[PDB]
Nucleic acid binder design. Structure first.
Lengths: 88, 31, 115, 38, 65, 96
RNA sequence: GGGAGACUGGAAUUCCUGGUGUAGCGGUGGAAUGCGCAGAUAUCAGGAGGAACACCGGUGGCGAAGGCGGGUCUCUGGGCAGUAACUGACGCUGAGGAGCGAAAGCGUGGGGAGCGAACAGGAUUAGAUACCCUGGUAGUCCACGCCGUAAACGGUGGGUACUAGGUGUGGGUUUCCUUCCUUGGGAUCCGUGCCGUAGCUAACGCAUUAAGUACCCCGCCUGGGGAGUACGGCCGCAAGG
């Protein structure tokens, strides 16, 4: 997974304030970074199915968090989607 | 459970597989 | 020739036993087998046949000048102790006893179990 | 007559097998030393 | 039973370089001794076995002399 | 930059006096690569447990190095190509 | 011993070469086919290759399941404990659907030591399309893809709360005997076994890891054969599902 400095930088960038780590924005940003790293790893090891299952779990968790953020407030959802370069 | 039921099922399955093997080319040519 | 000190190799399988007195460099100078002393079939897996083969090999080594020997036993136990005892009893001095049985580190597949 | 056969093929499954696996009435008793193994 | 001499406050670290510390843990045939005979904990038993294998791989311990 | 421990075995035919410079120029790849530090220790001329490459004795060397994974693999690859190195082994002195 | 990749170690089997060396070896309940006398088996030295990793190693660990242990390095997934900083119900289940899924099998290309369906002899037998023996091809192995089944079983779907205890064992935090060496002992959280209450069950048994007491969601059953078969359809190169 990500190192402490990458987590610190992502949290400082996407966090709602300078302390929050459990906001849906911060969680979704960290999940997106983790998913990109996993996709790069799986591009080389095509037959690493056990890690692919973890990738699926992360994707599902991010989808649920985005569902919550969209239901709570659509403007935040749109801002996050445009800032992170996601489709849905 | 008694293995008798498994025996009946296995004999039915074995006979059906034998029948399928005996008519493979005939089935291929009719289908 | 004259080899005062040599090595004795005993291979005891489940249906035979082969004794070969060996020059310490690995050259064989006299060998006797369970079937070489008049046994055949299942008769040659018996400890008595092992005793006879060991005695015959010991004599055939003795006229070659072999006086002291060290044994290297090997194989499933059938007549190993009997073979060593017969080696000693035939006028041969037995120095050291070593069990060298090939032990794989889980390589190669054994044959299927008999029924 | 089938149950009476008593030739080798009829008694090959009842002859004790293995060395330590399985036990039968006519199975060869294990050889035991004088002193306890310890 | 017996003591895991490594869980103690004086437990020396397990290495593949110190040969004697491993020689005390293998039988006279060069085989690795069992845990119940040795008495050490599971983690230390794994450390010992790995160290013995590594030492064998660099010809510091015989492969079953 | 992770810490590594490298143990090499050199054939005993060569003199023990030239072992230290020969390793020293070998570790020049790790040194100029990434500002990396070594602590070479030599305790050679020990008979091996089993014969290696038609040899019974060997010269043992222990190298403690802190470098990048790509650099160390490069050093390991070079060492095996050299004919005076009988065997070598790389450990990670980290938690691993 | 969670997974993927790369490199690499030793024992053993087989084969090849060269010494010593002779007449048997091999196999069985007992033998014979078979190998050897053109120098076998045995013993020693050297070489080639493939596969599996003794001891550690267990009712012990990890994984959703299938499953996973020679060593090292690289990349990567999950779990647990403590603090409780953060968000503030974001939870559960899940028709269809998608993915993974032992072994055997299938396609293309390599590899092939041992084992070994088929196939050959030998033996046993009234007969042996078998059991046993000697050989032995696919296959087993690798790369990339298909297949999609298993006694794929704990024959026990998932989540949650509650309901006597006793005793092993794995991981972690902590108070007190304190030598603080010691499974010292306790408490606690998460696993994994055994024995046992209440309760449940036709019985066997289960029993805080429920088959007890309840709530939410899903799958399935409705006498035995015919039959998981025919017909039609979908998937598959085919086997077939």
């Amino acid at each position: 997974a990500l190192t402490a400095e990458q987590k610190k930088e992502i949290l400082g960038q996407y966090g709602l304030h300078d302390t929050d780590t459990g906001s849906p924005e911060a969680q979704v940003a960290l999940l997106t970074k983790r998913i990109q790293d996993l996709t790069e790893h799986l591009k080389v090891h095509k037959h690493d199915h056990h890690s692919r299952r973890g990738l699926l779990l992360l994707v599902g968790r991010r989808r649920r968090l985005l569902k919550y953020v969209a239901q709570v407030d659509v403007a935040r959802y749109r801002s996050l989607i445009e800032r992170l370069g996601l489709r849905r | 459970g008694s293995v008798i039921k498994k025996r009946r099922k296995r004999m039915s399955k074995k006979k059906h597989r034998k029948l399928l093997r005996r008519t493979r080319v005939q089935r291929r040519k009719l289908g | 020739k004259n080899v005062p000190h040599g090595a004795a190799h005993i291979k005891s399988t489940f249906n035979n036993t082969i004794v070969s007195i060996t020059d310490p460099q690995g050259n064989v100078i006299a060998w006797a087998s369970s079937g070489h002393v008049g046994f055949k079939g299942s008769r040659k897996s018996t400890p008595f046949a092992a005793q006879l083969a060991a005695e015959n090999a010991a004599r055939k080594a003795q006229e070659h000048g072999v006086k002291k020997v060290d044994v290297f036993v090997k194989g499933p136990g059938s007549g190993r102790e009997t073979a060593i005892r017969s080696l000693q009893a035939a006028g041969l001095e037995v120095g050291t006893i070593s069990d060298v049985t090939p032990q794989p580190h889980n390589g190669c597949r054994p044959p299927k179990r008999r029924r | 007559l089938e149950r009476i056969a008593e030739h080798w093929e009829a008694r090959r499954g009842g002859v004790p097998a293995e060395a330590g696996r399985e036990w039968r009435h006519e199975s060869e008793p294990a050889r035991r030393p004088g002193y306890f193994p310890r | 039973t017996r003591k895991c001499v490594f869980c103690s406050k004086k437990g020396q670290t397990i290495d593949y370089k110190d040969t004697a510390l491993l020689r005390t843990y293998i039988s006279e045939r060069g085989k690795i001794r069992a845990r119940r005979v040795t008495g050490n904990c599971v983690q230390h038993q794994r450390d010992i076995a790995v160290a013995v294998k590594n030492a064998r791989e660099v010809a510091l311990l015989p492969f079953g002399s | 930059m992770r810490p590594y421990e490298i143990m090499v075995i050199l054939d005993p035919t060569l003199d023990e006096r030239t072992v230290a410079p020969s390793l020293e120029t070998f570790l020049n790849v790790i040194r100029k690569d990434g500002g990396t530090v070594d602590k070479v220790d030599i305790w050679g001329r020990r008979r091996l447990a089993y014969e290696i490459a038609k040899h019974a004795e060997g010269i043992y060397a222990v190298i403690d190095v802190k470098a990048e994974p790509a650099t160390v693999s490069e050093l390991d690859r070079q060492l095996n190509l050299n004919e005076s190195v009988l065997r070598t082994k790389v450990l990670r002195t980290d938690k691993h």
